[PDB]
Design a protein around this ligand. Structure first.
Ligand SMILES: Nc1nc2c(ncn2[C@@H]2O[C@H](COP(=O)(O)OP(=O)(O)OP(=O)(O)O)[C@@H](O)[C@H]2O)c(=O)[nH]1
Ligand SMILES: [Mg+2]
Lengths: 164, 165
């Protein structure tokens, strides 16, 4: 099989580990354990084996994000689209990560997860509120997804495979 | 003397070593406290961590390196492979341990052990400490005590290649 590496970052509770579970086994769970440090999983989709570094998003682990993003094929930045109170912190952590010189040029996929919830932001609002327009020195894309209801999981995978 | 008692002893020795290192680190009056290779508390800790990870290896001379490369990011593997004064896979196992402590990552690695029993059984005998569910869960609890301790260990230590005999 072909191989690629991706790193999944984003604030706690945004659905990073849930996303890995959904694309690995199709299984959504309402109750989850916060990731203490990092997880790693291999998932095969078609003929690409993807090695996923799933980093904890709790505050004390964000200092680790750059370490695990260096050299990978793409970074997936996960956002709880329904958690308005967290968007400001999510915006700041994303722009802080992308300011790191050793991550120059790596493509970024911003995922607005939990679109099934009633107050979830849509792709257009997420782009504005995360100031994605201000990123002009790398490829960046934004999709609104639901791990629970499965919206846009397939196009997310398609994007990741195009960056193998 | 029973293998269960032996494994229990190793874990008790890890427990005591973590506690002594915690107390040493908390009492340090340096402006930037950091555990280093020459600290006796570090040497005792790593001696006992190394025991737990070498116990029950199918191929002792290759060390736990051949397992943990499955769980380690590429740049860290490369960094260990190019160390000038670490020449063997056993030494690389120990340098990986020092790096894991530097990165406060031992818990994440031990969780990957629990999630990969197939890999564990390829490298360890059934009797091994990491192959016992009860013992591996306790090991993980013990090392969670190193999460907020600053380690500044030199990975390129030549004594790391010394094999048991
Ligand atoms: N309603 C809804 N809930 C979701 C969705 N995706 C994930 N969740 C829930 O969000 C919660 C957080 O899940 P995790 O996957 O552990 O979050 P994480 O980003 O890995 O968190 P850390 O490991 O702390 O960084 C879980 O309760 C999931 O059930 C979704 O699409 N819709
Ligand atoms: Mg998680």
């Amino acid at each position: 099989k072909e191989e690629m590496e991706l790193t999944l970052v984003g604030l706690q509770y945004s659905g990073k580990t849930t996303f890995v579970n959904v694309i690995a086994s199709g299984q959504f769970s309402e109750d989850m354990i916060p990731t203490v440090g990092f997880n790693m999983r291999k998932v095969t989709k078609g003929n690409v084996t993807i090695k996923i570094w799933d980093i904890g998003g709790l505050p004390r682990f964000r200092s680790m994000w750059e370490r695990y993003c260096r050299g990978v094929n793409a970074i997936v930045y996960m956002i709880d689209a329904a958690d308005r109170e967290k968007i400001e912190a999510s915006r700041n952590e994303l722009h802080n990560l992308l300011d790191k010189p050793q991550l120059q040029g790596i493509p970024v996929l911003v995922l607005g997860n939990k679109r099934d919830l009633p107050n979830a932001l849509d792709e257009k609002q997420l782009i504005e509120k995360m100031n994605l327009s201000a990123i002009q020195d790398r490829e960046i894309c934004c999709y609104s997804i639901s791990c629970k209801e499965k919206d846009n999981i397939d196009i997310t995978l398609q994007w990741l495979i195009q960056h193998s | 003397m029973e293998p269960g008692e032996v494994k229990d002893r190793i874990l008790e020795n890890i427990s005591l070593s973590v506690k002594k290192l915690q107390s040493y680190f908390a009492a340090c009056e340096d402006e930037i406290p950091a555990i280093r290779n020459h600290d006796k508390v570090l040497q005792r800790l790593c001696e006992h961590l190394d025991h737990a990870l070498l116990y029950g290896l199918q191929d002792l001379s290759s060390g736990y390196w051949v397992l943990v490369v499955h769980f380690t990011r590429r740049e860290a593997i490369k960094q260990i492979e190019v160390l000038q004064h670490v020449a063997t896979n056993l030494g690389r196992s120990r340098a990986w341990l020092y790096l894991a402590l530097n990165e406060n990552s031992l818990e994440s690695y031990l969780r990957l052990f629990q999630e990969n029993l197939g890999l564990l059984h390829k490298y360890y005998v059934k009797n091994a400490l990491v192959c016992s569910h009860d013992h591996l869960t306790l090991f993980l609890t013990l090392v969670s005590g190193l999460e907020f301790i600053r380690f500044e260990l030199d990975l390129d230590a030549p004594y790391l290649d010394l094999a048991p005999y």
